[PDB]
């Protein structure tokens, strides 16, 4: 792991000491190589997980998030290359440094053994995101968005610190291997239900729940792009990972402190997908879809079954890839029209007949297409929920219907129709922004060809 | 499609549109030609009666009554020409109507595959750029000072001029490309 | 009553321009200038059958329960290839 996060640190001098004309290239290529060397930790020939030190470990839940975080960086970096091309070189390099800092801190999170390491890094991730959203957003609502996105997190996370501190004072170590093998059943009192809530309602904010999600549209809609990629791809999964790690020390309270959150997730998933059915803003449509997806992950982690954790991991990775892809696809048009309004430009597939295939595949990923790690996750958590209660499929099916609807409606009212003939500024395409979608989709196909990796702790 | 409608829309074309759609729905009911011809003559008799009234408070009620008894016999599946609204082949080839400005982004490997076309196209664009300012001036110096106006688009009066706002009428893509 | 005196002239001017345009959209005889039976069977049916037979014979029929078929539906009064066991006939009907 050290061999993954030291080169990631060396990517920063590589930015600052290189020419202005040979800085995107070098850092992009070397980031791809970091992604390559982040495959050694998929060499798990055994059941025992990979401990490299007291600091760092890597389980089959860590490794996909690690690899995806190392893999997104070149994509963020190339997507961020048309805008801030007319920016001063120092400003460019500051953007690069923030993205690399995100990479490093997120790898450290997913590789951490203790919960306090994970805490300080889970919170250090806020500073790059806030800077990216605020200094490089295009609109004026970015400031309120940053405030929301920061303070929801901090409100949720201060109780988390208090609970971790309590657990240290009670057990002594706060390490995840030892909390696994030494976990006392809880006495089922209010003093422990508050502990459950303090441990959970930091991650549940970040995933997010439907009661608390207003930070995610305001941020996705206003972050330039790369912030949106990350905020859709791994910052939401940074809560699911934490829940999967911390739930082991909360049994048996999860059997009854989970009803409200499963229920909120399910109903609010339906609510969010219905919103996606009727939404003027494309970058908000993607965001509400992300809420409607992560709600299933919430319910799944609450059920704590093998099928459920499995499907949660699958849906995590799949949603991350396809959501980053859809944000790229919307940015591709926003870099020309400079409008997020979707019904503005609605008759493409004449000018962009190849991007319109990436659109289609991105949507089919989004809706439940079977030979895909999206439907595998959605199906397995549907099966877990049916085992839990047979009356949940009534809601999952409504979601499936609406999720076909808003995705196909997006495709239709953006591509299909009559071309907006008043748009002379529809430049043909960028090889860069075609390679982007290819690099988002080719992993989906590969992982569908081999989902033995993309499962989690339980398979 | 080419001519823009007025506001008032007086009595005569209301009556005529009624005559037209009534004959068409009758054609739909009376499928065979002999029957449609018979009942079309009968309908023209019905319209010829009450052709001369000089009572604009009787002709209007005749119109309302006729429209009501038309709606109570409106064929549910009337005939619709293809390439017309509500029918087949209406916007079918709209997926194949690419505008002219898409050629401005072509490479010099496709343009080399069609040189004489672009030779003519460049001088077309030159014509446009030359006529634009005089065209704007003509539209400016013919504004109805009372305020009211229409989508009438006056023509060119002098020589060397072009009929204003023509680049979207001319250069409109063909209907079967 | 139809086109006003000015509408008719507008229409004629646009007609002249439109016809000129559509004539300019014609292609010269040189215009698209550019630089320049069982083989179907043996190259689309035999090679895939070779590869597929290789797979079926040496990666599927080797593994235990890949290919499974029903019984071959014996009948009374036949000798069996595997053991020579003769199934007897049915008792005589009336």
């Amino acid at each position: 792991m050290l061999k993954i996060i030291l080169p990631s640190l060396m990517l920063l001098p590589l930015t600052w000491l290189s020419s202005p004309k040979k800085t995107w290239t070098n850092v992009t290529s070397y980031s791809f190589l970091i992604s390559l060397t982040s495959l050694t930790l998929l060499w798990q020939t055994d059941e025992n997980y990979k401990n490299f030190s007291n600091m760092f470990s890597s389980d089959p839940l860590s490794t996909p998030l690690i690899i995806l975080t190392a893999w997104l960086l070149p994509l963020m970096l190339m997507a961020s290359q048309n805008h801030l091309k007319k920016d001063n070189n120092v400003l460019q390099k500051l953007y690069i440094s923030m993205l690399i800092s995100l990479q490093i801190l997120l790898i450290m999170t997913f590789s951490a053994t203790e919960l306090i390491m994970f805490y300080i890094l889970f919170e250090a991730t806020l500073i790059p995101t806030l800077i990216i959203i605020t200094r490089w957003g295009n609109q004026t609502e970015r400031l309120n968005a940053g405030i929301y996105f920061l303070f929801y997190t901090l409100i949720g996370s201060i109780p988390l610190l208090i609970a971790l501190i309590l657990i240290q004072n009670h057990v002594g170590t706060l390490n995840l291997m030892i909390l696994s093998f030494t976990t006392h059943t809880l006495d089922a009192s209010w003093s422990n239900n508050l502990l459950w809530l303090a441990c959970m309602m930091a991650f549940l904010i970040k995933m997010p729940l439907y009661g608390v999600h207003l930070w995610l549209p305001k941020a996705h809609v206003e972050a330039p792009i790369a912030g949106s990629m990350i905020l859709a791809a791994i910052l939401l999964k940074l809560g699911s990972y934490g829940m999967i790690r911390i739930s082991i020390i909360l049994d048996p309270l999860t059997k009854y402190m989970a009803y409200p959150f499963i229920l909120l997730s399910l109903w609010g998933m339906i609510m969010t997908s219905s919103i996606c059915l009727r939404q003027t803003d494309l970058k908000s449509l993607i965001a509400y879809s992300s809420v409607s997806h992560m709600a299933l992950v919430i319910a799944s982690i609450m059920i704590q079954t093998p099928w459920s954790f499995m499907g949660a991991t699958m849906l995590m990775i799949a949603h991350g890839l396809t959501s980053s892809l859809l944000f790229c696809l919307a940015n591709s048009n926003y870099e020309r029209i400079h409008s997020r309004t979707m019904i503005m430009a609605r008759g493409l597939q004449m000018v962009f007949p190849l991007m319109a295939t990436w659109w289609l595949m991105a949507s089919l990923a989004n809706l439940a297409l079977p030979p895909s790690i999206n439907l595998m996750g959605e199906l397995f958590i549907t099966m877990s929920l049916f085992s839990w209660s047979n009356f949940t499929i009534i809601l999952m099916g409504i979601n499936i219907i609406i999720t076909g609807m808003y995705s196909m409606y997006m495709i239709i009212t953006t591509q299909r129709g009559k071309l907006t003939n008043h748009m002379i500024n529809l430049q043909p395409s960028h090889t860069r922004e075609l390679t982007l979608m290819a690099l988002h989709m080719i992993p989906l196909i590969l992982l569908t060809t081999s989902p033995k990796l993309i499962t989690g702790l339980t398979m | 499609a080419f001519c823009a409608p007025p506001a008032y829309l007086t009595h005569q074309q209301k009556v005529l549109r009624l005559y037209k759609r009534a004959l068409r729905h009758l054609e739909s009911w009376c499928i065979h030609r002999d029957k449609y011809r018979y009942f079309a003559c009968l309908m023209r008799a019905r319209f010829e009666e009450h052709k001369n009234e000089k009572d604009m408070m009787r002709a209007t009620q005749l119109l309302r009554e006729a429209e009501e008894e038309f709606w109570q016999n409106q064929h549910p599946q009337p005939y619709i020409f293809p390439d017309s609204p509500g029918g087949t082949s209406f916007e079918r080839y709209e997926c194949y109507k690419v505008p002219e400005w898409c050629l401005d982004y072509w490479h010099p490997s496709e343009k080399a595959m069609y040189p004489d076309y672009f030779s003519k196209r460049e001088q077309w664009k030159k014509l446009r750029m030359e006529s634009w300012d005089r065209e704007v001036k003509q539209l400016q110096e013919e504004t109805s000072p009372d305020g009211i106006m229409t989508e009438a688009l006056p023509p060119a009066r002098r020589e060397g001029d072009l009929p204003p706002l023509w680049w979207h009428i001319v250069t409109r893509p063909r209907e079967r490309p | 009553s139809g086109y006003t005196p000015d509408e008719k002239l507008r229409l004629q001017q646009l007609r002249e321009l439109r016809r000129r345009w559509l004539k300019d959209q014609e292609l010269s005889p040189r215009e698209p200038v550019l630089p320049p039976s069982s083989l179907f069977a043996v190259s689309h049916v035999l090679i895939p059958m070779w590869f597929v037979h290789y797979y079926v014979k040496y990666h599927m029929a080797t593994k235990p329960y890949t290919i499974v078929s029903s019984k071959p539906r014996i009948f009374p009064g036949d000798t069996i290839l595997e053991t020579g066991e003769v199934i007897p006939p049915m008792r005589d009907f009336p």
Partner: peptide, 12 residues
């Protein structure tokens, strides 16, 4: 007899 089909770019 022949007519120019207007195509978007189809090079990139």
């Amino acid at each position: 007899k022949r007519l120019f089909v207007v195509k978007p770019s189809l090079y990139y």
